[PDB]
C-alpha cells in the first residue's frame, strides 16, 4: 500500500517563432525578465505537464491571461559567446536559481515558483540553442517522504479546485479550523495539517517535481509536523488525495530541473529558423515553386532536376552571354560559368543585358557571375579571363596562350553543356573541337544585322561541317557570325531563347520512334530572319572533311596535340590537307 | 618719316586639355608655379606673337627645353568661389603683377617678365574660366617714344640672333666699347647707346608690349639717356633697327597686359570639356555611333532619330516590360515609361529582367525606371505606381480609381507608343480603348505556356475585335494571355523582341504600292509556337461589333465618359448590348 513520492517534470516547453524573432530584435539593439500564462485547464490528453508557451510577448509587462490561467514569473539569459553558453556550470547556475526561490519561498510559499531559461543567439545562420530550467529544490537532501493513498473526495478536490482557479497567485492553499481553504499559514497547517498544492502534471500518480519545493519550505515551516495529508489538485479528474509521512534517510538541498532535449537527453535544445526567417531562403524556394507549380498544372511530364542540375558554359559574356545567361537562371540553372577575355565598355550596358554604366572598364567575365549573384544570390556564378586563340591567327607569346588551351579544357570539361557565343566564325574552332573531344554537348549561337543561327552537336555535323552563307547570297544576310556584334538589338534576344528553349527540350528524354520530347521538338538547327518574321529548320549530316568533326582531324589532335593547335591556328591551309579538301 | 612706338600683345595663349585636368587633380588633392618653353623660331605667318602653350607640364619643376627654346616663369591664381572670380579688380591684379616685376627689372632687367593667369574650374559641368595677364608696366606714363627707321643691319640683327639663341635667359643685350655683345649694363649702355630686345611679336613694324618693361627699367637706370638705338630682335627676317627718342606728354606707371578672349572682347575666356572628359557623355556618345555605324555600313536608309525620339509607354513592369525596356534602350529610345501598381516580390528577378535580390518588397515600377538609368544614366525613365481596372470586377473605391483612370489617359496621352503588357485579357480594355480614343499606337504582348502573340493597332483588328484562342484548341494552347506569367522562359523574351522590332519596323515610311519598309515587314499579328519552333502572321479586319473599338462603344465613351467605363467594367454583358453581340 506504501510508497515513495516520484515526481515529473513541472513543465514542458514550447518556444513560438515569434519569441525567437524578438529575442534576435533585442540582440541588435544580460539577465531578461519573462513571463507566462499557464492554462492548467487546456492540457492535451497525450502530455504529461503543463505546457510553457513562450512568444514574443512573455517578453514583455503588459501581458493579458485569460480568466483560470496562472501568471508565473520567470528569466532568459542570454549569451554571445557559444562556448560561454556551452562551458557553464549548468548544476551550478540552477543551483543559484534554486536558492533564490527558496529565498522567496520562507517568505511566501507561493513564490518559490519559477523558470529560467539560458540560451545563445546564431543571428546570421538563424540557429538558436537554448534550455529551459525549472528550479526544483528538496531541503534537506536526506529527507524523501512515504506516502499512502486515500479513497478520493471529490467533494475536497472540488472545492480546493475552485479556489485555485479564483486565486491565480496561490500554488498552496490548507483547511482553517472550520474546515474551510484558506491561504498557506505555518501557524494553522501545524494543527490542521492539510496541504493542498496546484500541480501541474497529469503524470497519473505523479506529482509535479515543483511538490519538492514546497515541502522543502513547509519543512523549513513546521520542523515537527512528520505527519499529514497531501492533495495534489489538478484541474481535471486525476486529482487524488495522498496520507503523507516524513522520512529521512541518512541542511543539503539537491537540486534538479533542466529539461530533456527532443531526443530525450539531458542537453539544450537547438532550433535552425533559417528555412523560414532567410529571406535568402525565402527567396530561393520561390523561385523553386515557380517552376514546381508550372510544372504541375501545364506538363507533370517535365523533368526540372536534370536542367536544375546542368552545368553551363559560356563561353563570352557579351550581348549573347548575358540573356542566355539570363534565361538559363529563369529555368533553374544553379551553374553557370562566364568564360570572356575583355572588359565591359561605354557601348556595353544598353546592349550586353548584365551591365550597368558603373561598371565600365572593369574586367567583363568576372563582373557578369558578379551581376548573376545580385539577381540570385545562391547562383553559382562564375568567371574567368581566358582567351579564345582565332584560326589564321599569328600565334602570340605561345606559351601563356598554351595555358589559355589547357585552362579551356578543364573547363570545357568540368561542364555538361557548352555554349558557344562568339563573334567570329574563327573563334568557334578550338572550342568546338575541345568540346567534340570532350563528349560535351554544344549549341552554338551567330548574329547577323537581320537573322541568327542556332544549332547543337552531341551522327549530326557541326558547325564546321558545311558553310552557313554562301558567296551568292544577300548583303545582309552574308554579315552572319561575320564579327557582327552590333545588329538589330531584337536579334540577341531571340537567338538566345531559341538556344536556351533548344537546350532544355533536347535535356528532356525522347519518345521512342520520334524526334520530340515533352517540350516539343529538338531541331538540328534553327534560322531566324527579322525583314520577314520567319523561322526555319533545317538538319545537316557530318560532313567527311570537315576541319573540325572530320576523323582525320579528330585524329591528329589525338595524337600530336597542341603541336597540332598551334599549327592549325597559324595556318589553316594545314587543316584542309588534313581533312581532305585539298 | 617720324612715329610714336605702337605695341602688339607680348603672347597668345593656348591651354591644352592636359593643362585642365592637371589643374583639376590639384582642386581635388591659393598661387600656383608655373612654367613655360616658348619656340621663338617656330612661329606661323598666320600669328601676330610668339604661341604660349600650356600643358600639364606647365605645372611641373622638371620642364624641358629643347636647343633654342626660352624658359618663362609665371603663375596661376585659382578660385573656388566663381563670384571672387568674377569679382576681382582685374586691373589692381595685373597692377600688383607689375609692381613684382617692376621690383625684379630693377635689379636685372632680364627679370622683369612673366605672365600668370586667374582661373574658376566648374569641375562638376567641367566648365573653365581663365584669363592670361601679361605684366607689361610703362613708367613714367608721361613718357612716350619717338622713333625713326633705320636701314637694315642683317650683320647686326643676325649678331644678336646668336647672342639670344645661346643666352636663353636674357631678353636683353647692348655692345660693350669694342661694339661686341654683351650683357646688359647701365653704365655700358649710358655710354654705347644700344639696346637690343628678345622681340615675341611678329606685328610687322610693332614690337612685344614687352618692350614697355625694359625702357621703363631703362629709363630708371639712365635718367639723362635721351636719345639712343633700339634693336627689336625677331628669330626671322622682321629684325629692324629703330633710331629712338625719349619723349615726354605731360612716377606715374600705367600696366596693360589682359588678352582678349575669342571674341575679341577684354574679359575672361571659358572652355567646356564636358564632351571630351565627360564619362557620361563619352559613353552618350558611344551608343549613339553604334548605330550611326550600325546603319552607315549596313542599312544608310535606316530612319534612327523616330525612333530614338519615340516616347515609349510600358503598361507593366514585369517580365515583359523589363526585356521591352531593354530592347527599346538599345535601338535608342530615350523617354520611357514605366506604369505598374506591384513591387518586386522574391520570386521575380530571376524572371524579370530589370530587378536584384536586394529590390524585393519596394514598388516595382519606379524602380525600373531607376534600374534602367543604372544602366544607361542619360535615359528619360519614369515610374508610375497606377492601377489599371479589370472588366468584370467590382468597382472598388470609386473614387481613386477613377483617378487611376484619369492619371491612365494623361499618359496614354503624353506618350506616342503605348505597349500592351499585361497578364489577362480583362486587363488590356480599359487601356486599348483609350488609346485608340486618343490616336495612339499600341502593341500588345500576350503570354502563354508555349505560345505568344504581338500585335498592332494604328482599318486593321484590335486585340478585341476576334477571340484569339477557340475553345477546342489545345491546353498548352489555351493558357495564351490567361493571367499565365509564369510560363517557359524564353517565351516573353520572343514575344519581347519581336514586339519591339515590330515597332521599329512599323516606325519607318512604307513603300508605296507594298507594307514594308526598309527593315522588313509590319504584319499585324505574329504568332509563335516553342514545341515546334515556328512563327506564323495573320491579319485581321476590324470587327463590326467588337467591345473595344467598334463605333458603337467608341461613340458611348464619348458621349458618356467616365460613367461609361464604370459601368462596363463591372458588367460585362452591358459592352455586349452597346456593341451588338446580343
Ligand atoms: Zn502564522
Ligand atoms: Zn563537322
Ligand atoms: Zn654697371
Ligand atoms: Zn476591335
Same mark, same amino acid.
Given at each position: 500500500?506504501?510508497?515513495?513520492?516520484?515526481?515529473?517534470?513541472?513543465?514542458?516547453?514550447?518556444?513560438?517563432?515569434?519569441?525567437? !524573432?524578438?529575442?534576435?530584435?533585442?540582440?541588435?539593439?544580460?539577465? !531578461?525578465?519573462?513571463?507566462?500564462?499557464?492554462?492548467?485547464?487546456?492540457?492535451?490528453?497525450?502530455?504529461?505537464?503543463?505546457?510553457?508557451?513562450?512568444?514574443?510577448?512573455?517578453?514583455?509587462?503588459?501581458?493579458?491571461?485569460?480568466?483560470?490561467?496562472?501568471?508565473?514569473?520567470?528569466?532568459?539569459?542570454?549569451?554571445?559567446?557559444?562556448?560561454?553558453?556551452?562551458?557553464?556550470?549548468?548544476?551550478?547556475?540552477?543551483?543559484?536559481?534554486?536558492?533564490?526561490?527558496?529565498?522567496?519561498?520562507?517568505?511566501?510559499?507561493?513564490?518559490?515558483?519559477?523558470?529560467?531559461?539560458?540560451?545563445? @543567439?546564431?543571428?546570421?545562420?538563424?540557429?538558436?540553442?537554448?534550455?529551459?530550467?525549472?528550479?526544483?529544490?528538496?531541503?534537506?537532501?536526506?529527507?524523501?517522504?512515504?506516502?499512502?493513498?486515500?479513497?478520493?473526495?471529490?467533494?475536497?478536490?472540488?472545492?480546493?479546485?475552485?479556489?485555485?482557479?479564483?486565486?491565480?497567485?496561490?500554488?498552496?492553499?490548507?483547511?482553517? @479550523?472550520?474546515?474551510? *481553504?484558506?491561504?498557506?499559514?505555518?501557524?494553522?497547517?501545524?494543527? %490542521?495539517?492539510?496541504?493542498?498544492?496546484?500541480?501541474?502534471?497529469?503524470?497519473?500518480?505523479?506529482?509535479?517535481?515543483?511538490?519538492?519545493?514546497?515541502?522543502?519550505?513547509?519543512?523549513?515551516?513546521?520542523?515537527?509536523?512528520?505527519?499529514?495529508?497531501?492533495?495534489?489538485?489538478?484541474?481535471? /479528474?486525476?486529482?487524488?488525495?495522498?496520507?503523507?509521512?516524513?522520512?529521512?534517510?541518512?541542511?543539503?538541498?539537491?537540486?534538479?530541473?533542466?529539461?530533456?532535449?527532443?531526443?530525450?537527453?539531458?542537453?539544450?535544445?537547438?532550433?535552425?529558423?533559417?528555412?523560414?526567417?532567410?529571406?535568402?531562403?525565402?527567396?530561393? !524556394?520561390?523561385?523553386?515553386?515557380?517552376?514546381?507549380?508550372?510544372?504541375?498544372?501545364?506538363?507533370?511530364?517535365?523533368?526540372?532536376?536534370?536542367?536544375?542540375?546542368?552545368?553551363?558554359?559560356?563561353?563570352?559574356?557579351?550581348?549573347?552571354?548575358?540573356?542566355?545567361?539570363?534565361?538559363? *537562371?529563369?529555368?533553374?540553372?544553379?551553374?553557370? %560559368?562566364?568564360?570572356?577575355?575583355?572588359?565591359?565598355?561605354?557601348?556595353?550596358?544598353?546592349?550586353?543585358?548584365?551591365?550597368?554604366?558603373?561598371?565600365?572598364?572593369?574586367?567583363?567575365?568576372?563582373?557578369?557571375?558578379?551581376?548573376?549573384?545580385?539577381?540570385?544570390?545562391?547562383?553559382?556564378?562564375?568567371?574567368?579571363?581566358?582567351?579564345?586563340?582565332?584560326?589564321?591567327?599569328?600565334?602570340?607569346?605561345?606559351?601563356?596562350?598554351?595555358?589559355?588551351?589547357?585552362?579551356?579544357?578543364?573547363?570545357?570539361?568540368?561542364?555538361?553543356?557548352?555554349?558557344?557565343?562568339?563573334?567570329?566564325? /574563327?573563334?568557334?574552332?578550338?572550342?568546338?573541337?575541345?568540346?567534340?573531344? /570532350?563528349?560535351?554537348?554544344? *549549341?552554338?549561337?551567330?548574329?547577323?544585322?537581320?537573322?541568327?543561327?542556332?544549332?547543337?552537336?552531341?551522327?549530326?555535323?557541326?558547325?564546321?561541317?558545311?558553310?552557313?552563307?554562301?558567296?551568292?547570297?544577300?548583303?545582309?544576310?552574308?554579315?552572319?557570325?561575320?564579327?557582327?556584334?552590333?545588329?538589330?538589338?531584337?536579334?540577341?534576344?531571340?537567338?538566345?531563347?531559341?538556344?536556351?528553349?533548344?537546350?532544355?527540350?533536347?535535356? !528532356?528524354?525522347?519518345?521512342?520512334?520520334?524526334? %520530340?520530347?515533352?517540350?516539343?521538338?529538338?531541331?538540328?538547327?534553327?534560322?531566324?530572319?527579322?525583314?520577314?518574321?520567319?523561322?526555319?529548320?533545317?538538319?545537316?549530316?557530318?560532313?567527311?572533311?570537315?576541319?573540325?568533326?572530320?576523323?582525320?582531324?579528330? /585524329?591528329?589532335?589525338?595524337?600530336?596535340?597542341?603541336?597540332?593547335?598551334?599549327?592549325?591556328?597559324?595556318?589553316?591551309?594545314?587543316?584542309?590537307?588534313?581533312?581532305?579538301?585539298?
Amino acid at each position: 500500500s506504501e510508497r515513495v513520492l516520484s515526481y515529473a517534470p513541472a513543465f514542458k516547453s514550447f518556444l513560438d517563432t515569434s519569441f525567437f !524573432q524578438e529575442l534576435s530584435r533585442l540582440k541588435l539593439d544580460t539577465c !531578461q525578465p519573462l513571463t507566462v500564462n499557464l492554462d492548467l485547464h487546456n492540457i492535451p490528453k497525450s502530455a504529461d505537464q503543463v505546457p510553457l508557451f513562450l512568444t514574443n510577448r512573455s517578453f514583455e509587462k503588459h501581458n493579458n491571461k485569460r480568466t483560470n490561467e496562472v501568471p508565473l514569473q520567470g528569466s532568459i539569459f542570454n549569451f554571445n559567446v557559444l562556448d560561454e553558453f556551452k562551458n557553464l556550470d549548468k548544476q551550478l547556475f540552477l543551483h543559484q536559481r534554486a536558492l533564490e526561490c527558496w529565498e522567496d519561498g520562507i517568505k511566501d510559499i507561493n513564490k518559490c515558483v519559477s523558470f529560467v531559461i539560458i540560451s545563445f @543567439a546564431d543571428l546570421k545562420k538563424y540557429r538558436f540553442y537554448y534550455w529551459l530550467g525549472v528550479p526544483c529544490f528538496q531541503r534537506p537532501s536526506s529527507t524523501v517522504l512515504h506516502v499512502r493513498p486515500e479513497p478520493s473526495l471529490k467533494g475536497l478536490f472540488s472545492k480546493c479546485q475552485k479556489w485555485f482557479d479564483v486565486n491565480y497567485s496561490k500554488w498552496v492553499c490548507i483547511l482553517d @479550523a472550520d474546515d474551510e *481553504i484558506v491561504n498557506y499559514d505555518k501557524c494553522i497547517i501545524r494543527k %490542521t495539517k492539510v496541504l493542498a498544492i496546484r500541480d501541474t502534471s497529469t503524470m497519473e500518480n505523479v506529482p509535479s517535481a515543483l511538490t519538492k519545493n514546497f515541502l522543502s519550505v513547509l519543512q523549513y515551516d513546521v520542523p515537527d509536523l512528520i505527519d499529514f495529508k497531501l492533495l495534489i489538485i489538478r484541474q481535471n /479528474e486525476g486529482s487524488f488525495a495522498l496520507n503523507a509521512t516524513f522520512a529521512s534517510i541518512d541542511p543539503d538541498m539537491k537540486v534538479s530541473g533542466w529539461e530533456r532535449n527532443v531526443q530525450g537527453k539531458l542537453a539544450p535544445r537547438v532550433v535552425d529558423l533559417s528555412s523560414l526567417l532567410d529571406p535568402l531562403k525565402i527567396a530561393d !524556394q520561390s523561385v523553386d515553386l515557380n517552376l514546381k507549380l508550372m510544372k504541375w498544372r501545364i506538363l507533370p511530364d517535365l523533368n526540372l532536376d536534370i536542367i536544375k542540375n546542368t552545368k553551363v558554359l559560356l563561353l563570352g559574356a557579351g550581348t549573347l552571354g548575358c540573356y542566355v545567361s539570363r534565361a538559363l *537562371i529563369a529555368w533553374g540553372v544553379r551553374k553557370i %560559368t562566364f568564360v570572356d577575355n575583355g572588359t565591359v565598355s561605354y557601348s556595353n550596358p544598353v546592349r550586353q543585358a548584365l551591365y550597368n554604366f558603373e561598371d565600365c572598364g572593369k574586367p567583363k567575365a568576372e563582373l557578369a557571375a558578379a551581376s548573376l549573384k545580385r539577381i540570385f544570390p545562391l547562383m553559382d556564378a562564375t568567371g574567368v579571363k581566358l582567351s579564345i586563340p582565332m584560326i589564321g591567327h599569328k600565334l602570340v607569346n605561345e606559351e601563356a596562350q598554351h595555358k589559355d588551351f589547357d585552362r579551356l579544357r578543364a573547363l570545357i570539361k568540368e561542364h555538361d553543356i557548352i555554349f558557344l557565343l562568339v563573334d567570329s566564325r /574563327e573563334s568557334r574552332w578550338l572550342p568546338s573541337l575541345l568540346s567534340n573531344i /570532350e563528349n560535351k554537348t554544344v *549549341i552554338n549561337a551567330a548574329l547577323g544585322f537581320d537573322s541568327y543561327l542556332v544549332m547543337r552537336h552531341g551522327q549530326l555535323g557541326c558547325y564546321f561541317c558545311h558553310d552557313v552563307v554562301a558567296p551568292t547570297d544577300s548583303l545582309t544576310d552574308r554579315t552572319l557570325d561575320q564579327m557582327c556584334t552590333v545588329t538589330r538589338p531584337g536579334v540577341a534576344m531571340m537567338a538566345s531563347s531559341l538556344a536556351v528553349e533548344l537546350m532544355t527540350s533536347l535535356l !528532356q528524354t525522347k519518345y521512342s520512334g520520334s524526334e %520530340t520530347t515533352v517540350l516539343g521538338d529538338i531541331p538540328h538547327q534553327i534560322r531566324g530572319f527579322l525583314h520577314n518574321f520567319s523561322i526555319l529548320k533545317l538538319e545537316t549530316p557530318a560532313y567527311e572533311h570537315c576541319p573540325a568533326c572530320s576523323p582525320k582531324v579528330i /585524329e591528329a589532335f589525338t595524337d600530336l596535340g597542341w603541336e597540332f593547335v598551334k599549327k592549325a591556328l597559324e595556318h589553316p591551309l594545314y587543316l584542309e590537307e588534313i581533312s581532305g579538301l585539298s
